[PDB]
Amino acid sequence: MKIVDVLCTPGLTGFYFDDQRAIKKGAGHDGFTYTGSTVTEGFTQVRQKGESISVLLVLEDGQVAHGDCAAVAYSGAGGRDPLFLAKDFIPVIEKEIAPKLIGREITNFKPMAEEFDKMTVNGNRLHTAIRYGITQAILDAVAKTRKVTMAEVIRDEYNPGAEINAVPVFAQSGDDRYDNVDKMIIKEADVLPHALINNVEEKLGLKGEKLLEYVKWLRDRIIKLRVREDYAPIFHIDVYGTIGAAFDVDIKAMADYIQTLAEAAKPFHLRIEGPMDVEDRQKQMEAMRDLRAELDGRGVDAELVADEWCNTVEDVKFFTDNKAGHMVQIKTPDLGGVNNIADAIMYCKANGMGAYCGGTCNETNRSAEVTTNIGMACGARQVLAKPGMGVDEGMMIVKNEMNRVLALVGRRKKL
Amino acid sequence: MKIVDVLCTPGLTGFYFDDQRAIKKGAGHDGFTYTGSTVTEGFTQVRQKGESISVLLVLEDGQVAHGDCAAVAYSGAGGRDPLFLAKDFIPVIEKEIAPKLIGREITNFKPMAEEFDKMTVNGNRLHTAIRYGITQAILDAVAKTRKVTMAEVIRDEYNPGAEINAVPVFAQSGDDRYDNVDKMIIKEADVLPHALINNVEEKLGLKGEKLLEYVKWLRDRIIKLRVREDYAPIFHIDVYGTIGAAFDVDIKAMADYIQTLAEAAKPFHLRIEGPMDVEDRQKQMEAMRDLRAELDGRGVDAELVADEWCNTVEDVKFFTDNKAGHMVQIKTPDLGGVNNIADAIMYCKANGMGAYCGGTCNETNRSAEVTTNIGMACGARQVLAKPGMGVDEGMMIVKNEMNRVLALVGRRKKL
Ligand SMILES: [Cl-]
Ligand SMILES: [Mg+2]
Ligand SMILES: [Mg+2]
């Protein structure tokens, strides 16, 4: 099957481009908007519409493969590629990438994805978001050519022989950590709520006392609201390094604190994302490794999820190798070509590291469908319900795709 | 080409099933839930998860057509089919419709959709949600057989010789009529905000003063936040009959009051949905017609959008024939077969009535893509951004689908 055409359309995402540098300097509030001057190049406002590029591969048989280019909300922030304005990046795809695809015979997903993930123009690598879209399109093209699900393609090429099963769906609440919890309970998230505990005083408490009461509220809320008695989701709470800050990164003091969180969470199981956030990757690994080893040596039944300083596939291998937490976050848009997600997940598996197949609230419905398929195929420990902060939509996009994929795969076994 | 297999999966939606009867009975808000006894049959809490049924037709070439069965959030309410629980209706599909689809030749969309729309079981019509889902799936099957967009199939069969263009996108705010407005301005909604003015004293104001003030605020908000000065969206406010109630359905008084909103909305054009809500369909048509008469005769360029008592295709024909409003809401989930959306729009356009291609917050990402296609094909006046109350997600689904479909058609025009 040849590719005969390549179309690009600009688009929306499930959220916003936020000027992080402006927000961290003290950008004020006004309704759903931020105020004051923009700090980051390219921004016209501190908050503006998040953008995507839909990449369409017209196939020889007339089918159309579809992937979406997207970046995180903090597009163009520290250590990221420039603000992903479709206007700036459609011309690159149309003049540098499309001619490399038109007339190409569709081969396996792995080699083609890798070619396009590493490709250079003027000796310079492609914007992560473009690699993200183009490889999603390529995966969808392989799947359509072979008449199977994207999951199945990824399984064949990255996880030979394995079963494809449902993956636990993790929902994120943002600051509305009470109302969106209700949403998640009612939509039966397998993992919840993130809770956006990004403030020591306001959100954690100076002694961690606020999060402690939140965990108790959360446990009770589930017991009260759940339709089915046997619905028992896993707690996943992101403390943006505030446990570290509130306890001066004292390994033992953090673990003692975390133990009381666990006591408060029971009967439910507790995952804490980003306990600490220290000053370099080496020392983040060490602090995660040792806090895990502390928790583990004492038999405190809480898991740590890596985030801060764990970005690249190389990072994923580094945190994995060194058991720097119990779960490593695989950051789908940041990794560029979606083949890297599968590589990263499969490394985690091979080394017994829990794999959180993540994403951004600022990507699309399509990009979410694709990476869900990857998550399923590689047996990730959980996948993010995404995009958007509405919760319902993100859960629907991700779980419905999961459900249909399992239906189709199961049909194929009995043929 | 035939359909070779049918798969049904249970799914989520962008929203919830709410027991409307209980909500009117006085169910108290608690977080994102409602307290107390359910009043409607089949409900187990006053708010429960929205449910969908993804319908997949496997065709003999190995492509998979996908349609989503979905109902309104007030599933099971007055004049409605029973609460659309997946577990209740999947077996109906599997037993009664799958055998009729497996082995069926793909001919044209129109006769296939009509057969399945009007299909009976033990003498009784099928649930509107099943008809909704099945016909979507059929439409997609037809498109995939012909290797064209869903829009092009509908254009070919209902709107011959027409171009397919972008359609104004309308966003709903729900009660958060302030912050969600900000969203819509940042995402550049063509029509906004709905505003859920569903209460006389709290929302409209007794003498209309609250809506008037909200209009003023809305106008300033757009001028305040718009990225580019020539963004001039259309105001569309739903008032749930309350202008009728506050002004004793007096035509002159209502005409006078909308004139003031119109004046307060300038430079922005205003549409008011459901100005009144009377005792029966006949008196509803008359009030709509006479109110439009007054405004038109007085040259107040503000429009009236029909809703209440305008439900089926005969109703849309009824409101069209008697110029009862300037626009009519085509209620996509409620109409069953999606072929009926095409018939209703095209009637409206043959007789110079605005066609509002609607939907629900409680349908799916897929149903929204499909009916968006129908809207474009028949050249609707506007389409609802949907599903979900998040706003961002429903705008992305609807508008990103819109842009891709136009890119594909434009390509086909140059082939
Ligand atoms: Cl909240
Ligand atoms: Mg984190
Ligand atoms: Mg209405």
Curated annotation (Swiss-Prot), chains A, B:
UniProt activity-regulation remark: Inhibited by calcium ions.
Quaternary structure and interacting proteins, as annotated: Homodimer.
Temperature-related activity annotation: Optimum temperature is 55 degrees Celsius. It retains only half of its original activity after a 30 minutes incubation period at 50 degrees Celsius.
Effect seen on changing H194R: It abolishes deaminase and aminase activities and does not show any major conformational changes
Name the record gives this protein: Methylaspartate ammonia-lyase
pH effect summary: Optimum pH is 9.7.
Catalysed conversion reaction: (2S,3S)-3-methyl-L-aspartate = mesaconate + NH4(+)
Pathway: Amino-acid degradation; L-glutamate degradation via mesaconate pathway; acetate and pyruvate from L-glutamate: step 2/4
GO MF annotation list: cobalamin binding; metal ion binding; methylaspartate ammonia-lyase activity
UniProt keywords, alphabetically: Cobalamin, Cobalt, Lyase, Magnesium, Metal-binding
Binding site for (2S,3S)-3-methyl-L-aspartate: Q172, Q329, T360, C361
Active site per database record: K331 (proton acceptor)
Result for mutant: K331H: It abolishes deaminase and aminase activities and does not show any major conformational changes
First-level EC class: lyase
Mutation effect (K331Q): It abolishes deaminase and aminase activities and does not show any major conformational changes
EC number in record: 4.3.1.2
Top-level taxonomic group: Bacteria
Residues forming coiled coils: none
